[PDB]
C-alpha cells in the first residue's frame, strides 16, 4: 500500500500541553467517485537525439547546450594560463603564441618534414627521404595538434607558388597523405582542403615542350582523383559540399571562352564530384550543342599542341560518359541513334564501343 500516488497528509491531536500526536489523514469516499474518475495522462514514448557537446575543446552556443549564465577551469598556482584560451572563452585577455601551445619536439618535427618534402634535388637518397616523410605523415599516431598547421601550410604554398609544378604536385601528395591518416578527425576542415585542390584543377595557368603538358595533365588528373576522394569521404557532415562543387565545375564547363585545359579539368571535376546521375542529367543533354560550338573549331586546328589538346578533351569527355555504368546488326541501329543524340564527335566514339547497357542509359534521357 505504499505505492500510492495520493499525497501524504498528517493530522495532529493533543494529549495535553506539549504532547502532540500525529495520525494519517483518511476519509471515507464512495465507489462512484473512484470508478468514474478519469485516468492520468499518458507520457510520450522513449526516443533519443544527438548534438555536438564540444568541437576541438570548445562548447558551441547552440540551444542544446547550457547557457553561459548557468568552477570548470583550474585556478591554482600551477595551472597554465593558456588553458583558459583553449576553452574559447570570451573574457580571456591572454593571447598564446605558438611556443606556448606546441612542444619543441613537434616544432622540430614539422620543420624537418617541410624541409624534406620540398627538396627538388634529383638524388635518389632525396627521393627516399621524401617518401619516408610522406609515410611518416601518413602513419604517425601523435599529430593531433598540427592538423590546422598542415591545412594552412598547404593553402599558403598553393597560393604563393602557382608557377611551379613540382611544388604543386608535392602539395597535392601531402594533402592526400593527410586525409589518409586513421587517427585524425578531419570533418570540419574538409572544405578548407577542397579549395586548394580545385585551384590545381581549373587554374588557367599552371607552371611557366611536351614535358610541360605531361606534367600539367598529370597534375590535373591527380587533383580530380583527390577531389573524388574528398567528396566521397566528407559529403555527409558537410551537407552543401557536393552541390557546391558540382555547380562550380558545371559553371566552368559550359563556357566556350575557356581554354581546352580548363574544360578538361572542369569535366573531370563534374564527374568526380557529382557522380553518374549528375553526368546523365546535366552533361549529356547539353552535349549536342557543345560539340558544334566548341569542338569543331578546335578540331580544325593543325598544330601538334592543338591535336594533343583535342585528343585529351575528347578522351576526358568519353571517360565521363563511360562512368555512368563503368544483338547482331540490330544493336548497330541503337548505336546510330546515339550519333544523333550525342553528336558526331562523341557519338561515334561511344558507338564504336559496342555496348548495350551504356547505349540504353544514354538514350533514356533523350527527351531532356
Amino acid at each position: 500500500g505504499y505505492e500510492s500516488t495520493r499525497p501524504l497528509r498528517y493530522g495532529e491531536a493533543s494529549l495535553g500541553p506539549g504532547q502532540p500526536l500525529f495520525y494519517i489523514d483518511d476519509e471515507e469516499v464512495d465507489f462512484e467517485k473512484v470508478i468514474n474518475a478519469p485516468l492520468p495522462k499518458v507520457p510520450r514514448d522513449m526516443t533519443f537525439t544527438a548534438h555536438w557537446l564540444a568541437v576541438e575543446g570548445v562548447q558551441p552556443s547552440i540551444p542544446q547546450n547550457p547557457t553561459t549564465a548557468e568552477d570548470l577551469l583550474p585556478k591554482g598556482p600551477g595551472a597554465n594560463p593558456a588553458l583558459a584560451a583553449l576553452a574559447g572563452n570570451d573574457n580571456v585577455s591572454f593571447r598564446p603564441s605558438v611556443k606556448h601551445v606546441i612542444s619543441k619536439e613537434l616544432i622540430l618535427y614539422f620543420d624537418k618534414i617541410q624541409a624534406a618534402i620540398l627538396d627538388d634535388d634529383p638524388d635518389e637518397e632525396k627521393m627516399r627521404l621524401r617518401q619516408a616523410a610522406l609515410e611518416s605523415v601518413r602513419s604517425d599516431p601523435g599529430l593531433h595538434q598540427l592538423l590546422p598547421y598542415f591545412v594552412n601550410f598547404i593553402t599558403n604554398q598553393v597560393t604563393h607558388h602557382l608557377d611551379d609544378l613540382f611544388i604543386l604536385r608535392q602539395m597535392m601528395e601531402l594533402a592526400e597523405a593527410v586525409v589518409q591518416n586513421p587517427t585524425l578527425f578531419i570533418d570540419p576542415y574538409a572544405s578548407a582542403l577542397a579549395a586548394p585542390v580545385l585551384t590545381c584543377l581549373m587554374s588557367r595557368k599552371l607552371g611557366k615542350i611536351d614535358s610541360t603538358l605531361r606534367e600539367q595533365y598529370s597534375l590535373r588528373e591527380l587533383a580530380a582523383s583527390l577531389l573524388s576522394m574528398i567528396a566521397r569521404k566528407y559529403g555527409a557532415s558537410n551537407a552543401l559540399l557536393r552541390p557546391k562543387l558540382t555547380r562550380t565545375c558545371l559553371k566552368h564547363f559550359l563556357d566556350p571562352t575557356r581554354p581546352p585545359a580548363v574544360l578538361f579539368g572542369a569535366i573531370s571535376g563534374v564527374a568526380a564530384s557529382g557522380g553518374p546521375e549528375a553526368v546523365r542529367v546535366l552533361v549529356l543533354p547539353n552535349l549536342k550543342t557543345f560539340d558544334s560550338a566548341v569542338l569543331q573549331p578546335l578540331r580544325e586546328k593543325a598544330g601538334p599542341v592543338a591535336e594533343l589538346e583535342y585528343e585529351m578533351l575528347v578522351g576526358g569527355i568519353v571517360k565521363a560518359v563511360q562512368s555512368i555504368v563503368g544483338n547482331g546488326a540490330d544493336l548497330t541501329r541503337e548505336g546510330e541513334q546515339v550519333i544523333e543524340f550525342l553528336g558526331p564527335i562523341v557519338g561515334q566514339r561511344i558507338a564504336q564501343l559496342r555496348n548495350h547497357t551504356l547505349n540504353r542509359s544514354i538514350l533514356e534521357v533523350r527527351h531532356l
Binding site: 546521375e277 542529367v281 533514356e364 534521357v365 527527351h367 531532356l368
Partner: peptide, 8 residues
C-alpha cells in the same frame, strides 16, 4: 527527382 527527370 530522378524518376521525374526520366519521365517523358
Amino acid at each position: 527527382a530522378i524518376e521525374s527527370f526520366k519521365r517523358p
